[PDB]
Design a binder for this molecule. Structure first.
Ligand code: 289
Ligand code: 289
Ligand code: 289
Ligand code: CA
Ligand code: CA
Ligand code: CA
Ligand code: CA
Ligand code: CA
Ligand code: CA
Ligand code: CA
Ligand code: CA
Ligand code: CA
Lengths: 146, 146, 146
């Protein structure tokens, strides 16, 4: 019996692993325990944020070079800059994750963030992986993390 | 062995939970034990019906307000009215599920169904969640349930 | 604690089966233990091949009439001819899989392969399921197998 349950769990592990690859192709990227997935279209920050939260996740929040590289692959594939989850909407000059925590990693392009026009509280990631603070009202690729 | 086998099932459960969220974003919606998934494009009723059946499911068949609201979320997201599986092709005035049973739930807009032009045997759901009988030849968003 | 796990596995099995069908709709097709999935866009051969390999799979490689029929379903649904993995880049006239192994199945359209222009080393599958050797530089629907 204990062995009969083995044959099942074993089959499940194999089937699940195959299904995982299928699911991630071509809009997902796995990095560590995190999975990034793009919706394939653009939206303003507030709408992008809501879409990810309702899906049980949150906007892409790269916390390391490895995660940022994984996210970058999606941006390049779609050739569309994407929104990150971080903003300095609460306190200008201080970017935070949705929880309020301060950034543990950043990859700002030279000179950024610069709050251009005194109205850039959101963050976009370019095809080169670099970050730029941009107006939250702009529309960018929606990428959520799970 | 149980000790280790429990660790495997626990890993599968956790991994699967994550992947379910990933899979449903952004074209799926879970409600109870039913899952709605949109193909993202429009098709006439017959073509839409065949796509769903060949995929191992059937056209969206909301049987409760909760299921209807879940379906509505997809229709709103794609901003395209979708076909439901029910029709009154067999007997005019009596809408049934693909199996033949009569409806157990309905959310008709006022005055519907009205068999306009004496030729509306299919059903579409609007972005406001209401139903309208419509010509089966029209093209509407394809949403299947599994 | 035995019946405990057995219960969880059965239910995990059922949930996985449902998510499998949801996953394949509308861009995937399962045949045997193989799964075909289209990216939904076209790319030149090398780029397409790279996308599949990086995803942990490879370009569509139908090895039987059954596999070819399943692949043809996706080509028909997308209405776009797709690249297969096989090429005769090494030895003109001799088509092989990425491993170097010779074909074990083929469905060449009448008059094919003809190496037209003296430079057609890749293979495409039409909506009718037939194959045609085509210049690897052309762009065709990307379909991987897992
Ligand atoms: O609204 C200004 C933006 O379009 C960007 O213009 C220039 O690239 C730089 O000033 C950026 O920092 C700014 O976000
Ligand atoms: O064929 C007529 C339809 O386009 C719809 O026209 C009006 O909105 C109402 O008569 C509807 O009931 C009808 O389905
Ligand atoms: O470059 C020519 C291709 O477009 C194909 O056109 C026709 O299908 C046939 O001549 C094929 O052999 C050719 O590869
Ligand atoms: Ca500000
Ligand atoms: Ca700012
Ligand atoms: Ca800026
Ligand atoms: Ca009628
Ligand atoms: Ca009618
Ligand atoms: Ca009507
Ligand atoms: Ca050649
Ligand atoms: Ca050739
Ligand atoms: Ca040819």
């Amino acid at each position: 019996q204990v062995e009969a349950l083995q044959g099942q769990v074993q089959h499940l592990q194999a089937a699940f692993s195959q299904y995982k690859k299928v699911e991630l192709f071509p809009n997902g990227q796995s990095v560590g325990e995190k999975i990034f997935k793009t919706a394939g279209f653009v939206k303003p920050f507030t709408e992008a944020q809501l879409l990810c939260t309702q899906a049980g996740g949150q906007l892409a929040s790269p916390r390391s070079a490895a995660e940022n590289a994984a996210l970058q692959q999606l941006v390049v594939a779609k050739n569309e800059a994407a929104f990150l989850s971080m903003t300095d909407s609460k306190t200008e000059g201080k970017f935070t994750y949705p929880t309020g925590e301060s950034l543990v990693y950043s990859n700002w392009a030279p000179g950024e963030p610069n709050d251009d026009g005194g109205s850039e509280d959101c963050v976009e990631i370019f095809t080169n992986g670099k970050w730029n603070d941009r107006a939250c009202g702009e529309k960018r690729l929606v990428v959520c993390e799970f």
